[PDB]
Amino acid sequence: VRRYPWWWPYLRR
Numbered sequence: 001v002r003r004y005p006w007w008w009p010y011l012r013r
Contacts, residue, residue, distance in 0.1 A: 002013050 001009055004013070005011075
């Protein structure tokens with residue numbers, strides 16, 4: 001949950 005999508009974190013964060 002750095003800033004990108006809510007789903008993004010799983011992607012990289």
